[PDB]
Design an enzyme around this catalytic site. Structure first.
Site, PDB file in Angstrom:
ATOM      1  N   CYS A  30       1.057  -1.183   0.095  1.00 42.84           N
ATOM      2  CA  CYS A  30      -0.114   0.008  -0.053  1.00 42.84           C
ATOM      3  C   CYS A  30       0.726   1.372   0.011  1.00 42.84           C
ATOM      4  CB  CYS A  30      -0.877   0.111   1.127  1.00 42.84           C
ATOM      5  SG  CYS A  30      -1.924   1.531   1.611  1.00 42.84           S
ATOM      6  N   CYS A  33       0.218   3.511   3.205  1.00 42.88           N
ATOM      7  CA  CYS A  33       0.885   2.822   4.301  1.00 42.88           C
ATOM      8  C   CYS A  33       2.204   3.157   4.362  1.00 42.88           C
ATOM      9  CB  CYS A  33       0.646   1.321   4.193  1.00 42.88           C
ATOM     10  SG  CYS A  33      -0.877   0.417   4.709  1.00 42.88           S
TER      11      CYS A  33
END
Ligand SMILES: Nc1ncnc2c1ncn2[C@H]1CC[C@@H](COP(=O)(O)OP(=O)(O)OP(=O)(O)O)O1
Ligand SMILES: [Mg+2]
Ligand SMILES: [Mg+2]
Ligand SMILES: [Mg+2]
Lengths: 105, 667
Positions: A30, A33
DNA sequence: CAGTGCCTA
DNA sequence: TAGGCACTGG
């Protein structure tokens, strides 16, 4: 000073812990993230003694996330004496994060 | 000769009303329309043409119009109407013969967009008529602010339907004359629209007569249907479903769920460079939200939407994801960027974890159980979805659906029922049987007669190489069972593996795979078998020289004279042998039924026997008694010998018959 | 609707 | 090295 959780330790490290614990549900794939990760390292050091920063990689530990109905990552879940007090999803900035914490702590 | 078509309220199975009909008469060159109250006159006109020793042309009349009219005459007029097979022509049957290289929609049952290749125009229009009429009806309704109910365009007669009826006959006439203009099938010196039926069949190519007899007989086979054990398949379903559940429970415990990106709209861009990152999962940037704001989003704070996914054993993608994670490194990929994940590779996959390694077997068992459930109960073409009220499955058959002359089967495909030697095949196969039909008078179950042509294509091969080896092969064949004689040499496991081998060979890796070894064994066996029969090379050569030169001619002449399209120089031999096999079998089932009838036996459930299925070179026949079953078996053998003599075949042809209650026992 | 893979002969 | 059809994923 970040606490790296696993499915099997989550219960006692998060739910049975004392004080506020910020849990970050993330995945290596991600982008967002990867963006907030650095921010979390700084928060962990800055909020020592007043907050605990934990992280749970949902790919290595697939059992926990579903119980909280995750629909997007990163998911920041704040636990207070066993339960979720507040929740924020997305790559917040340090400033936005500090506000989220201060206001919620 | 007359050309006709009818419009009725439903499919053959439930048709109860004749709406209208149209007749074009070549001798008057006029079109005559018949409305609902003209039904009696419509029939009179058809029987008048029959009285003249004339001909009646319908498009797909063998499966619909003709049977439908017999049915409607009895129901509506309490009249006995039965058009003789010899007086009927079918332009669909004709097109499938002449344009055997083209697919068709099977009268609208198939979506044309899905079919490969081109489609003959006239036949296309005829096949799309119902759908077009429906579209007109709907728009016309909505135009009048009226609502449309599925299939209401067929409940009542109307002039729109009448106009389509006339159009069908005009197009059918045009199709007919276009087919009749093919000099290979119809001698140019004869006007086939101006001769009696006797002349039409005798003067046209044999294939023309053969295909019509085949369509007439198979149409009857469809109406008979195959008695089916519904209760047994439902009980099988329950058993397969529970095992499916249990395998899913075990597999979802071994292979846990995970999250996957999903719903992302925007492109993730490097927060510093701006550099678009295509590979990264798509994100979503909330427009509303702030830090007290209970909401969980913050404007400008991007996140990756994701979804929770449970291990689906039916997913090749999921299987591949978990096995590589377990250390599996694929060897063969699909020509589209994807690791091959079929039973064969699964069988060879090795991983360290013993539980995951054992789970591979559960995955294979699960895929297979799904194949059976899908075919027997859940698929769109599932047997349980097709069993009719009469307790039978009436599968459809395109008598000439394959280019080689073989027929095709669908709705559902009764030529692909699991074999007895495969998992659950005995239960599947046993569900299709004569025993499941109770005689309409005595209530006693019927008996089944299964007959299969013996070593069919190996004998066709012997026939064709006879001019190169003077019959050595054909002679060597009738010296025990060739396939058993093969299995021994090839040192093969089963007699089926020996068949699949010899046919793969006759038509190194693939050979080795089928035999269970590598390209080395495949090679050795390929030579040991070729060296054994050298004339096979001469036959091949002769075939190549006749077709290739860039084609010299792209078709081969079948046993009944028709053109058999050759797709590729390499598939030539196969085309030649499969066509021979197909045509032999086709004349065979025609002769078998004709002989039973000449013996005084009646075809039908209200008679003595009923063709239930024809799977290339085997027939499954339902028989009222064991004695009739014995007569059917012996008669089928005689018909085969008759076919072999009919075409001066250079190898003796035979059949093998089995008597039993169902397909499990009769094949 | 396309990519895969299995069922039959 | 003739065909039908199911299930997944977009
Ligand atoms: N795998 C195959 N590849 C190509 N053609 C095949 C294949 N299997 C069967 N055929 C063709 C050739 C024989 C024909 C009928 O099938 P079947 O298996 O009954 O023939 P067979 O002559 O091998 O067996 P049998 O003597 O037992 O009836 O269909
Ligand atoms: Mg019609
Ligand atoms: Mg055979
Ligand atoms: Mg057979």
């Amino acid at each position: 000073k970040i606490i790296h959780l696993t499915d099997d330790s989550f219960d006692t490290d998060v739910l049975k812990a004392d004080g506020a614990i910020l849990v970050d549900f993330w995945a290596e794939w991600c982008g967002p993230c990867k963006m907030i990760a650095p921010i979390l390292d700084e928060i962990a050091d800055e909020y020592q003694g007043k907050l605990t920063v934990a992280k749970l990689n949902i790919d290595q530990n697939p059992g926990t996330a579903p119980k909280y109905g995750i629909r997007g990552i990163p998911t920041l879940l704040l636990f207070k004496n066993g339960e979720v007090a507040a929740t924020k999803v997305g790559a917040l900035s340090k400033g936005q994060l500090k506000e989220f914490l201060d206001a919620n702590l | 000769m007359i050309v006709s078509d009818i419009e009725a309220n439903a499919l053959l199975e439930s048709v109860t009303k004749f709406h209208c009909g149209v007749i074009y008469d070549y001798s008057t060159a006029e079109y005559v329309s018949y409305r609902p109250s003209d039904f009696g006159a419509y029939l009179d006109a058809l029987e008048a043409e029959v009285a003249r020793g004339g001909l009646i042309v319908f498009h797909n009349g063998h499966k619909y119009d003709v049977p439908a009219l017999t049915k409607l005459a009895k129901l509506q007029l309490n009249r006995e109407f039965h058009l003789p097979r010899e007086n009927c022509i079918d332009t669909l049957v004709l097109s499938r013969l002449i344009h055997s290289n083209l697919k068709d929609t099977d009268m609208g049952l198939l979506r044309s967009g899905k079919l490969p290749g081109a489609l003959e125009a006239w036949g296309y229009r005829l096949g799309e008529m119902k759908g077009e009429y429906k579209d007109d009806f709907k728009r016309m309704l909505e135009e009048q602010g009226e609502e449309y109910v599925d299939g209401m365009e067929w409940w009542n007669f109307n002039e729109e339907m009448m106009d389509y009826n006339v159009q069908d006959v005009v197009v059918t006439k045009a199709l007919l004359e276009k087919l009749l203009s093919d000099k290979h099938y119809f001698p140019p010196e004869i006007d086939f629209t101006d001769v009696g039926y006797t002349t039409f069949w005798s003067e046209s190519l044999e294939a023309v007569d053969i295909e019509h007899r085949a369509a007439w007989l198979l149409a009857k086979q469809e109406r008979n249907g195959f008695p089916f054990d519904t209760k047994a398949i439902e009980e099988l379903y329950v058993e397969l479903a529970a095992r499916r559940s249990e395998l899913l429970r075990k597999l979802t415990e071994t292979f846990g769920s995970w999250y996957q990106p999903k719903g992302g709209t925007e492109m993730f861009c490097h927060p510093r460079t701006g550099k678009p990152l295509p590979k990264y999962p798509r994100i979503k940037t909330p427009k509303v939200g702030g830090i007290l704001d209970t909401r969980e989003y913050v404007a400008g704070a991007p996140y990756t939407p994701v979804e929770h996914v449970v291990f689906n054993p039916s997913s090749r993608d999921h299987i591949q994801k978990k096995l590589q994670e377990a250390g599996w490194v694929p060897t063969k990929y699909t020509d589209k960027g994807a690791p091959v994940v079929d039973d064969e590779v699964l069988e060879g996959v090795r991983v360290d974890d013993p539980e995951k390694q054992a789970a591979i077997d559960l995955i294979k068992e699960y895929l297979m159980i799904q194949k059976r459930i899908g075919q027997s109960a859940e698929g769109d073409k599932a047997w349980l979805r097709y069993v009719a009220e009469d307790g039978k499955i009436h599968g459809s058959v395109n008598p000439n659906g394959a280019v080689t002359g073989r027929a095709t089967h669908a709705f559902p495909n009764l030529a692909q029922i699991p074999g007895v030697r495969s998992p659950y095949g005995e239960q599947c196969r046993a569900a299709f049987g004569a025993e499941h039909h109770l005689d309409g008078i005595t209530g006693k179950p019927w008996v089944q007669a299964g007959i299969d042509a013996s070593g069919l294509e190996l004998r066709c091969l012997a026939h064709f190489m006879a001019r190169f080896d003077n019959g050595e092969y054909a002679h060597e064949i009738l010296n025990g069972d060739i396939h058993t004689k093969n299995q021994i040499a090839a040192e093969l496991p089963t007699r089926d593996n020996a068949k699949t081998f010899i046919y793969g060979f006759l038509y190194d890796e693939k050979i080795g795979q089928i035999v269970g070894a590598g390209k080395e064994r495949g090679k050795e066996l390929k030579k040991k078998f070729l060296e054994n029969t050298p004339a096979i090379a001469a036959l091949r050569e002769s075939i190549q020289q006749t077709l290739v030169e860039k084609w010299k001619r792209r078709w081969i002449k079948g046993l009944d004279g028709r053109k058999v399209h050759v797709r590729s120089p390499h598939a030539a031999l196969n085309t030649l042998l499969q066509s021979a096999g197909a045509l032999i079998c086709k004349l065979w089932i025609i002769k078998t039924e004709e002989m039973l009838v000449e013996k005084g036996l009646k075809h039908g459930w209200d008679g003595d026997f009923a063709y239930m299925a024809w799977v290339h070179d085997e027939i499954q026949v339902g028989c009222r008694t064991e004695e009739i079953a014995q007569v059917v078996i012996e008669t089928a053998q005689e018909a085969m010998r008759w076919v072999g003599d009919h075409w001066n075949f250079r190898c003796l042809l035979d059949t093998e018959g089995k008597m039993g209650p169902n397909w499990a026992i009769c094949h």
